[PDB]
Amino acid sequence: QREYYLREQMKAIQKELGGEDGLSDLEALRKKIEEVGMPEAVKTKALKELDRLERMQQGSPEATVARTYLDWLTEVPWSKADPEVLDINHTRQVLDEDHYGLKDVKERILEYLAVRQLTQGLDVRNKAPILVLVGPPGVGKTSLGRSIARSMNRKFHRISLGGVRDEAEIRGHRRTYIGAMPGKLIHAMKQVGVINPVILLDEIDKMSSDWRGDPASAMLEVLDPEQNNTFTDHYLDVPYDLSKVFFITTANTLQTIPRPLLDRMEVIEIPGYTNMEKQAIARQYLWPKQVRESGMEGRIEVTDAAILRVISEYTREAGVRGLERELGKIARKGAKFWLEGAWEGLRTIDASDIPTYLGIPRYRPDK
Amino acid sequence: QREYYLREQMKAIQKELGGEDGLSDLEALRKKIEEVGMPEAVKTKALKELDRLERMQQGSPEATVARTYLDWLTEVPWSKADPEVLDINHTRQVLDEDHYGLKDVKERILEYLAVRQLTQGLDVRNKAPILVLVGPPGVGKTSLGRSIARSMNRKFHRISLGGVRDEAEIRGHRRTYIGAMPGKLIHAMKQVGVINPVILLDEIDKMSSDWRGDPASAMLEVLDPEQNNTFTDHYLDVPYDLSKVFFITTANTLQTIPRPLLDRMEVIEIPGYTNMEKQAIARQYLWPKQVRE
Amino acid sequence: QREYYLREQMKAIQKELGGEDGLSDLEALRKKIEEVGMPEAVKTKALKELDRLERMQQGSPEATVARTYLDWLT
Ligand SMILES: Nc1ncnc2c1ncn2[C@@H]1O[C@H](COP(=O)(O)OP(=O)(O)OP(O)(O)=S)[C@@H](O)[C@H]1O
Numbered sequence A: 001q002r003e004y005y006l007r008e009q010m011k012a013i014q015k016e017l018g019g020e021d022g023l024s025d026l027e028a029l030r031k032k033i034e035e036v037g038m039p040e041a042v043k044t045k046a047l048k049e050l051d052r053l054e055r056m057q058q059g060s061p062e063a064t065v066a067r068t069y070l071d072w073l074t075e076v077p078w079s080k081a082d083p084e085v086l087d088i089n090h091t092r093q094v095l096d097e098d099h100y101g102l103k104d105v106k107e108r109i110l111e112y113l114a115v116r117q118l119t120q121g122l123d124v125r126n127k128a129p130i131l132v133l134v135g136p137p138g139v140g141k142t143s144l145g146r147s148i149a150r151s152m153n154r155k156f157h158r159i160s161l162g163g164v165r166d167e168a169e170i171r172g173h174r175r176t177y178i179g180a181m182p183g184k185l186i187h188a189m190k191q192v193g194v195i196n197p198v199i200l201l202d203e204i205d206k207m208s209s210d211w212r213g214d215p216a217s218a219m220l221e222v223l224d225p226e227q228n229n230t231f232t233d234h235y236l237d238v239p240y241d242l243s244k245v246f247f248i249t250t251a252n253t254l255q256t257i258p259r260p261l262l263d264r265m266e267v268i269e270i271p272g273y274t275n276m277e278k279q280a281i282a283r284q285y286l287w288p289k290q291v292r293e294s295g296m297e298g299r300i301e302v303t304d305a306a307i308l309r310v311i312s313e314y315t316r317e318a319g320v321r322g323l324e325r326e327l328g329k330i331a332r333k334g335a336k337f338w339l340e341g342a343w344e345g346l347r348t349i350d351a352s353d354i355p356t357y358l359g360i361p362r363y364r365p366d367k
Numbered sequence B: 001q002r003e004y005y006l007r008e009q010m011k012a013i014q015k016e017l018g019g020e021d022g023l024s025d026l027e028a029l030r031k032k033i034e035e036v037g038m039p040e041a042v043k044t045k046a047l048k049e050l051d052r053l054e055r056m057q058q059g060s061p062e063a064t065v066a067r068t069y070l071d072w073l074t075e076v077p078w079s080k081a082d083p084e085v086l087d088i089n090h091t092r093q094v095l096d097e098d099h100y101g102l103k104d105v106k107e108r109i110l111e112y113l114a115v116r117q118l119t120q121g122l123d124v125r126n127k128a129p130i131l132v133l134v135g136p137p138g139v140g141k142t143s144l145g146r147s148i149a150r151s152m153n154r155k156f157h158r159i160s161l162g163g164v165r166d167e168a169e170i171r172g173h174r175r176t177y178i179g180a181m182p183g184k185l186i187h188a189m190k191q192v193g194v195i196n197p198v199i200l201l202d203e204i205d206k207m208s209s210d211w212r213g214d215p216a217s218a219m220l221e222v223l224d225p226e227q228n229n230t231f232t233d234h235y236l237d238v239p240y241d242l243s244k245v246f247f248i249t250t251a252n253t254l255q256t257i258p259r260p261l262l263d264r265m266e267v268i269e270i271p272g273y274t275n276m277e278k279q280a281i282a283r284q285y286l287w288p289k290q291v292r293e
Numbered sequence C: 001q002r003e004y005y006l007r008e009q010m011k012a013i014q015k016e017l018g019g020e021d022g023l024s025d026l027e028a029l030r031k032k033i034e035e036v037g038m039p040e041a042v043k044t045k046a047l048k049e050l051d052r053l054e055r056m057q058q059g060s061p062e063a064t065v066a067r068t069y070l071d072w073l074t
């Protein structure tokens, strides 16, 4: 009765002090606290904190730090996941809808997805592969992340490490500063609603160092499967649990990745396509896209011999960006010729009609 | 006590005079957020930041950061465009009165406009081209930029690369840092009022790259032909759409461009003029200008 | 001056509800510094925080550094 009557007096004085807020402030933040999570030390630290913002209303810069720290602390997911997959026959069907070929990456995903069923007595969910995909520029390394996320029914988020020179892009700044915010990883874990997404780190061989810091030293702490159980940035004081996260990183060469990161990654090399692989990719992915995006759908059509003519005589490369630029050129000039004088039915571009659209061939074929 | 008395007089008769007060700033910002654009995640972000701002101390070392951030969010463009499909003969007549010859670039622009006429009213993806123009040092590579922009009635902006070694020119800073502000691309999209300008990136093959300082790797995100739906600099913490903007870049050799950056761009050779072309250019463009001046 | 009076009376009530919460920030130190071990200079430098008392419920920017200092020291 004594603690309750004193808390009644607190409620009364705050009632004349509050204006529906200062009053509905906690039932905001404690439905936020008691609904999600949480680990016990983090909850006790947050509750030994939450009392101590009796400081606004003639103030404060003290309350606008603490309440936003509690806002960041109650919207990052604590132990809330998505259901695991039950067919490895459905994952294969979804992976074959988006890309042609690429048997090594697809089989490696199916292997590490079939290991995760058979293990009860758990050593495996602590170790998802830190996977790195290495290859020449036109091959589908970046567009393969979203398909892997869709086939396992998991959430996706891409982080681009292109020219990052700054620590506190990985970690944060401590909340004693003015505009302190957490890093990219806590922000990505907030955007994704769950604790087990797929995260793509786009060019990891391209990070820059600096005199003040080096983000590779911070990226070691994230991709280490002995430290990311207790990952801690500078904004959130509490340790945070990664390693439910499935990381995929992509790269052009291995020679400029730092040495403490190469030894903790499994490397899959992607070599570049042959001409039959490029002809299949062209026919069932690249030509319908370029026909749709130019308006000429149902009015023009290319044959297989013409696709071989384009591949052999107008491009040489490992990937497929130049091939889709040539096919888009055929679509643009088809639109131009239609808009001059229309025809009916569909015009069929045969292999002796390619220099009408593309010009003089660039490479002479071997014979 | 006297300076406290001054404090309370000034706060009273200033910010509670009634008429000449800050009715307009926060509430006009409130109504401005829900008019221009914007995507729903960005709008939720902006409204939560505004509600965070409306409880801060009068001052302030932290309210300036939030108000500057909301100003940058509200005056960058979201879904506003000067119009597409035009008359094609009128644009070829405008293109022919600024430059002699150069048939490949003119045909690329005209068949872009043909595609814009045929896809009018459909529900298909619209992606703007990304070109590089390669040639010897005197040919009209830079001069085609505002001519192509004036032909299609679009806004023009010119970023000069070359010598640039700082990565904080492409993206920005975190805005925890004190005088932070976004990169050149968001600033260029702010100067232009629309979401589809023509932006000239001039001498792209002269960016200076080493093991500390590499802005040519940050350009891989801005010129990616299907991942610049979501371009994130470090100042704005939202993904920004750079897929409608017509990029034209200029170079005079292809050897000092990195290979992943070269592979994202469509290359147009501009070879160098003959003697008959030089005589026509001198009769129609160079000698009347040098006579007038 | 009304709300100043109200903040100060509620802060009075708040530190009189801080018994064994804000009070008893010492007794882990009596548990672990009078054990086997610590020399007398460590007794001097370790009991440095008992009569620096009335500053953790008052503010502070340096309030919770006491549990940090003790949990790292003893
Ligand atoms: N097997 C494939 N089937 C279908 N499309 C493919 C295939 N391989 C590549 N592509 C397409 O190729 C395009 C370019 O692929 P990207 O992954 O974006 O290139 P990249 O792998 O990121 O390499 P970088 O970033 O230049 S080092 C995308 O539009 C993919 O859809």
Ligand SMILES: Nc1ncnc2c1ncn2[C@@H]1O[C@H](COP(=O)(O)OP(=O)(O)OP(O)(O)=S)[C@@H](O)[C@H]1O
Binding pocket: B098, B099, B100, B101, B102, B136, B137, B138, B139, B140, B141, B142, B143, B144, B251, B252, B281, B285
């Ligand atoms: N075909 C042309 N017709 C008319 N004027 C031209 C033509 N080619 C070049 N010029 C003029 O030549 C001048 C120089 O052109 P610029 O575009 O500045 O050359 P540039 O290619 O930009 O040089 P750099 O070294 O590569 S930046 C301008 O005044 C142009 O108007």
